Write a protein that binds this ligand. Structure first.
Ligand SMILES: NC(=[NH2+])c1cccc(/C=N/N/C(N)=[NH+]/N=C/c2cccc(C(N)=[NH2+])c2)c1
Lengths: 186, 186
């Protein structure tokens, strides 16, 4: 494809380097394409980026659907979602580029809106796990939305700020995390 | 002092203009020093930045030292330290250059040595809280170092990934987290 070759190179450059780092100049030439080749699909760089986040977000929740089966209780669903976050190849390898973007562009309308529900989809996975868990009586969270946001963020922290060490040590900490968290909810 | 001036001027430059944009040439002339002297003290902008970061760390510690007296029990120190990390970083100017620097050297293993002696200093704060918490029956943790890396990175994630919404709510969530986490330790 072409529009999909752009999305491909970009994603590659957004992960390696930052958001502000890589410029629409690179993306273009690195795809043997031309500048005037960006409009109805990718006019602005923030549009291009925000699109990739949307994709990877899909791929990741899609992958979680095909893998959340290995866990019967939601307590297990919680552990498994976190451990997996560390090994995936979707969304999470972009958290660094996302943090720049969230700051550098915090004075536009395509921040508190455009990518607004992009976060709700990210805390969504936990929204279910905690709700279904209240039905399946594994715990009792009277403020799911909070805990969800809290768990989502806490986890993303462990994933993002340890990306430089024995991947199996990360898994152990992440499981040690989930144990603590869950033992705190109940 | 010529060295301390270079750091201070550089700290100001990085803040006003970000990391990537600031040149060692600028630093040299504004601190009325020289390429020679700057090279001799830091060798590179990479390092210069790390030293500033180390100094910012010490200050954070001297600050935390005076502040923790407001917290008699370690359970309290945990709440306080987390809340301070969230509120203070919200209006910390060097933060932008840190983000920029971090997402520009977390792939180059060279800048991963000092880069971690540093993070370890941040984790110590939790380590002390947790250890001391043991010697007070505030809780029993036999894997302190672990629980420490966990709390540090989780808290860091809550602070960095929530960045969107009213500050009061953020503090609300950060306290919620500290409550749950400390409860899953008992
Ligand atoms: N109100 C305040 N007095 C206040 C508020 C927010 C932050 C600080 C001090 N921060 N000091 C920092 N953040 N030092 N960071 C240094 C550092 C060095 C190497 C690596 C990293 C890192 N984050 N990986 C950080 C002080």
């Amino acid at each position: 494809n072409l529009k999909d070759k752009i999305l491909g190179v970009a994603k590659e450059l957004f992960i390696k380097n930052g958001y502000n780092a890589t410029t629409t100049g690179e993306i273009v030439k690195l795809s043997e394409s031309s500048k005037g080749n960006l409009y109805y699909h990718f006019k602005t760089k923030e549009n291009l980026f925000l699109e990739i986040l949307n994709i990877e977000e899909s791929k990741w929740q899609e992958q979680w659907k095909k893998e959340q089966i290995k866990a019967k209780t939601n307590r297990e669903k919680f552990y498994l979602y976190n451990e997996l976050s560390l090994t995936t190849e979707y969304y999470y390898p972009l958290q660094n580029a996302i943090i720049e973007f969230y700051t550098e562009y915090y004075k536009t309308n395509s921040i508190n809106e455009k990518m607004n529900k992009l976060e709700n989809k990210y805390i969504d996975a936990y929204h279910v796990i905690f709700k279904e868990g209240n039905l399946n009586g594994e715990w009792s969270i009277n403020d799911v939305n909070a805990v969800s946001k809290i768990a989502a963020n806490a986890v993303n922290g462990i994933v993002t700020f340890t990306h430089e060490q024995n991947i199996n040590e990360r898994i152990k900490l992440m499981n040690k995390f989930s144990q603590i968290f869950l033992n705190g909810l109940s």
